[PDB]
Design a protein around this nucleic acid. Structure first.
Ligand SMILES: *C(=O)[C@@H](N)CCC(N)=O
Ligand SMILES: [K+]
Ligand SMILES: [K+]
Ligand SMILES: [K+]
Ligand SMILES: [K+]
Ligand SMILES: [K+]
Ligand SMILES: [K+]
Ligand SMILES: [K+]
Ligand SMILES: [K+]
Ligand SMILES: [K+]
Ligand SMILES: [K+]
Ligand SMILES: [Mg+2]
Ligand SMILES: [Mg+2]
Ligand SMILES: [Mg+2]
Ligand SMILES: [Mg+2]
Ligand SMILES: [Mg+2]
Ligand SMILES: [Mg+2]
Ligand SMILES: [Mg+2]
Ligand SMILES: [Mg+2]
Ligand SMILES: [Mg+2]
Ligand SMILES: [Mg+2]
Ligand SMILES: [Mg+2]
Ligand SMILES: [Mg+2]
Ligand SMILES: [Mg+2]
Ligand SMILES: [Mg+2]
Ligand SMILES: [Mg+2]
Ligand SMILES: [Mg+2]
Lengths: 151, 56, 117
RNA sequence: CAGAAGUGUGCAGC
RNA sequence: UGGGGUAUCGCCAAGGGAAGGCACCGGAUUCUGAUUCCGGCAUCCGAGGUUCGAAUCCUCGUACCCCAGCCA
RNA sequence: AAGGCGGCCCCCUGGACGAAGACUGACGCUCAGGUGCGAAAGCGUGGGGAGCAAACAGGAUUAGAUACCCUGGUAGUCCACGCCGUAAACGAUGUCGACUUGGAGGUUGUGCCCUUGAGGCGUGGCUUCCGGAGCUAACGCGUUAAGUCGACCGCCUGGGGAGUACGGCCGCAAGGUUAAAACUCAAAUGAAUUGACGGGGGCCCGCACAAGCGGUGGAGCAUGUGGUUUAAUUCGAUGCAA
């Protein structure tokens, strides 16, 4: 919008672990409004990640997300006759949104036998600093530093 | 434009002095003026128009 | 090889490239680097960042002689006319003097015709 | 930085 | 006859433990574009000798240019 | 005088203006024909040639690109002595003289006043910008008139054809100058007004873009249309807005 600026809509924290961040993650994994399906998938993935890691569920999720949150992104900036890619310091809320989106979209396209297990594997790899979500973060950073000349 | 950095002068203060000195000397403007030829008719036209706009 | 206490950094900064040359007080070149040679081509070749990188690579090139104090002579209008000096300072040389040596004709020769882009 | 062309011919509002 | 080159990614080009560009492909960018940036499978003219291993050293086989030879 | 004239120094040389007188005594103004000067490009002969750059070559761009952009590059640009004689050679405004409310500045003389200054008041030359009466189709001009008058000269008579043809003069040439007719149309034109438009400027909106999510274009089928077919495949809707 060009007139307005919008105040954020009220979210409700996750009922089992009390996290609004996990609530956002559920809301991103949700499809067609089937909230409870996404909740079941997320809870199964988190408990299996917990028993793999020897960590609490939110602790394992947080340490995974740490490994994939980007620090910079590339933005198209116009000039009177040209357009340049320029690196921009992405703000933390968008960092979390990006990391969750990348985790979810990476897991979705895995081959493993169920979405809960796909998700658990992708979170393990992310916590292990490996795999598709991490390579996504990585190449974003590569592009940013390759464009650093215009910053 | 020449700058001698004094003892205990901060380097960025020396940069500030250098920038202001070379700006005040007009060196960059004189370089930009000379990169292309300008017909004398064009020089006089621009002078005249600048003078014409210098009125309240 | 032979030690040198101090030297002059010559910065040649055109709109298309920046060359940084270190030389002894007598004008014998000790080392050089350029923005275009640091891996920047086209639009990036003439940015202050590319000139900073060129100055850094030039400072890394003269490490043999152990120069500690230098004088900076700046030539030309291009971008990176200043960022090179900051980079040279950060490399740890004592910037003793700064000077602009850009050639100014007292009228002199006729320059090229104006571009009708 | 690139971006060309648009067939002929008409009528009310006093 | 002798000497020296050349035959390595689809094309152009580096290497006693297969790189770069140009293509092609995916992604980012653009009003379309053109232009830019990140990622990608990648491949030593040939037989043998050496050796843990030679695009690579050592003989030979092959093919084509330069210079110099050649009185059935 | 116009074209024009820009580092510093010397030599030769033209004009302008101010103060105070003295002198001559209408000796003045304009000017057909004529004569001289006249940017740049161009021409002749002999030099010089750094930079720039018609022509030309290559690279790009593009549908093409005999261009714009890039890398080179010859005449030319410079000098001496001749020729050419044209320019938006413009203030698009002929020369000369008189008269008619003002204001702010620039530049260059000169007089008076305690000169006290970085000061006050007067009087000439040239020049920039506003604006009054008046004038003008309007825009605008406005004591430097496009105002009110006088003298003389040049020029115009609808748009094309045409500043062309032919003839004359001039020129090494390029060409310059003087200058028609047949024919053809009912307009061509100036200033300003209201819109619209601009790859002009400023400001501001809309799921317009951006940020996201889910789709269409691929498959089968339903349904509408185009085309074809038929005896008939009834008619209408046909960018957005069928
Ligand atoms: C062959 O060459 C024989 N007829 C002569 C020999 C020679 N001249 O070498
Ligand atoms: K004189
Ligand atoms: K005459
Ligand atoms: K040139
Ligand atoms: K075209
Ligand atoms: K030449
Ligand atoms: K007629
Ligand atoms: K001739
Ligand atoms: K009017
Ligand atoms: K579809
Ligand atoms: K469909
Ligand atoms: Mg046509
Ligand atoms: Mg039309
Ligand atoms: Mg000439
Ligand atoms: Mg000549
Ligand atoms: Mg000659
Ligand atoms: Mg050229
Ligand atoms: Mg004329
Ligand atoms: Mg006239
Ligand atoms: Mg006026
Ligand atoms: Mg009059
Ligand atoms: Mg007529
Ligand atoms: Mg004629
Ligand atoms: Mg004639
Ligand atoms: Mg969108
Ligand atoms: Mg379909
Ligand atoms: Mg189809």
């Amino acid at each position: 919008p060009r007139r307005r600026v919008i105040g954020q809509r009220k979210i409700l924290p996750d009922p089992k672990f009390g996290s609004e961040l996990l609530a956002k993650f559920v809301n991103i994994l949700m499809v067609d409004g089937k909230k409870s399906t996404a909740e079941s998938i997320v809870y199964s993935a988190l408990e299996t990640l917990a028993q793999r890691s020897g960590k609490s569920e939110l602790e394992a999720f947080e340490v995974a997300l740490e490994n994939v949150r980007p620090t910079v992104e590339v933005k198209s900036r116009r000039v009177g006759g040209s357009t340049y890619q320029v690196p921009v310091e992405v703000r933390p809320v968008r960092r979390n949104a990006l990391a969750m989106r990348w985790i979810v979209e990476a897991a979705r396209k895995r081959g493993d036998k169920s979405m809960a297990l796909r998700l658990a594997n992708e979170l393990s790899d992310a916590a292990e600093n490996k795999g598709t979500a991490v390579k996504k973060r990585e190449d974003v950073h590569r592009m940013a530093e390759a464009n650093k000349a215009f910053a | 434009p020449v700058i001698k950095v004094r003892e205990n002068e901060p380097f960025d203060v020396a940069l500030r002095r250098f920038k202001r000195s070379c700006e005040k000397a007009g060196v960059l403007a004189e370089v930009r003026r000379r990169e292309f030829y300008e017909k004398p008719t064009t020089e006089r036209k621009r002078a005249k128009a600048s003078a014409v706009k210098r009125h309240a | 090889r032979k030690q040198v206490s101090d030297g002059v950094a010559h910065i040649h900064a055109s709109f298309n490239n920046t060359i940084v040359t270190i030389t002894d007080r007598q004008g014998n070149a000790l080392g050089w680097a350029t923005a275009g040679g640091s891996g920047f081509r086209g639009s990036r070749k003439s940015t202050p960042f590319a000139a900073q990188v060129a100055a850094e690579r030039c400072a890394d090139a003269v490490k043999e002689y152990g120069i500690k104090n230098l004088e900076v002579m700046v030539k030309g209008p291009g971008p990176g006319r200043e960022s090179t000096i900051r980079a040279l300072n950060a490399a740890g040389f004592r910037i003793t003097n700064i000077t602009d040596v850009t050639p100014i004709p007292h009228n002199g020769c006729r320059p090229p015709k104006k571009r009708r882009v």
